[PDB]
Each structure stands twice: as C-alpha cells, then as structure tokens.
C-alpha cells in the first residue's frame, strides 16, 4: 500500500489522529515492531520539532527509522505526482523528433507546479536521464533545451529507458506521490527486447506506477498494449496531449 490521503499532505498539517495513522501505516510498510498508538501524542508540527534522539527514546526499536521516514516525506515537499517521460530516440524517429519534443514541451509547461515533479529519459541503443526527477522550473526549462538537442540514432531498447524510471521511483518515489510513466515510441521492438520491455514494465506496476504508451509514427498497437497497463492507456500522439491532460488533472485529486 501507499501513504493514505490524509498523509499525502505535508506533515505540518497533520493532525494528532493523522500521526497515529502514520505510525500504523509505517509499521506495516516496514515490518516494524508494533508500537502504542499513543507513542507520539501530538500533531505534525510537534513531531517536526522532535529530534532523532527523541524518536529513539520514544521508540527504541523503530524511532530512527520513523524519523528518517519523515525526512523522506518532507523531501517530497508538496509533490503529489511524479511524471516520467521515457522517450524513443532511435533511428526510426529521426525525422519526427520535433513531434516528440513538442509533446513533452506542452505537458511540461502545462503542469509545472509545486505538486508535480518531472523526469526526462531518452533511450535508443543506450538510455540516459536528461532531467533527474525535479519540480524546479529552471531545471525543467534547461531539461527541455537539452531535449531539443537530441540527435535520434540507434536501436530501440525501451527496457533500458524504463529501468531509469523505475530506479527513481524506488529511491525518490512512493510516499506522497503517485508515479506515471509516459513511454513515447513506435513499439517496433526486436529479439528479446519485447520480453525485456514487458518484464521491465512489470517492475513499474509493482512499484505502484501506471504505464502509458503514446504511439509515434505507424506504431505497433499490440506491443504498446503489452508495455502499458491496459489497452485504454495506449493512444497516438495526436490528441495525446489532451488525453494526458485529463488523466493528470484527475490524478491531481
């Protein structure tokens, strides 16, 4: 499971009842020795004032861990959803790269806010994180300039691209954010790559993320249905901006 809705808010707004809820959720998510619901009889503000020693004093068996758990929640700030762009830059898209860039550009510019964090990942014969997971506007702007300078060449090892999104969802994802993976590609895979891509996409859904596939050029509908979570999460680029704008506006509540 994942942080409950009440806990999706910044800790500073947490009620005393929220703090108790947080403790039980943590015990299950981290297999901790159960603690009394009255181990932290205070609100979020007060919890923020406690030292790590206070946590260890109140919970000798799990206080250090709970304290660190709280730090990670704080590190997400106001983020509510993380959006990962896994972009095909193979030779097949060398004459339609601007179509891919404009698609990322419009969605990025639309949803830049303290609630959103973006990552730009490109993949061909090798994968590269162009923009690490961030919600900072200046970083997002430079990331778009880097993205416009991609020279599409190579094979289509989409599993490598999805791996770079999975790793970030493990390290920085979860907690108060829902992760979405937008793979733009034509779905023309070779050899064992289809199995690798489906295996890598299986990791993504195990991390609680939803995989969307945006078909570029004459795209392989069947393949993208095996990468994405379902048939309804596979659409072409034309209208894909309006389609994704609705699903993101929806996940915003």
Question: What's the gist of this structure?
Answer:
With 253 residues, the protein is of the alpha/beta class. It has helices at residues 16-29, 44-49, 52-58, 63-75, 97-111, 137-148, 158-171, 193-206, 221-227, 240-251; strands at residues 81-88, 116-123, 127-134, 178-185, 210-215, 234-236. Belongs to the ATR family.
Would you kindly provide a written description of the structure presented here, covering whatever features stand out?
It is classed as peptide binding protein. By secondary structure, this protein is of the alpha/beta class. The chain has 2 domains: 5-76, Transcription Factor, Ets-1 (DNA polymerase, domain 1, Orthogonal Bundle), CATH 1.10.150.50; 81-252, 3-Layer(aba) Sandwich (Rossmann fold). The protein contains 10 helices and 6 strands. It has a 6-stranded mixed β-sheet, with helices on both faces. Strand 2 and strand 3 (127-134) form a beta hairpin. Helix 5 packs antiparallel against helix 6, helix 5 packs parallel to helix 10 (240-251) and helix 7 (158-171) runs parallel beside helix 8. The chain is elongated, with a radius of gyration of 20 Å. The two termini are 18 Å apart.
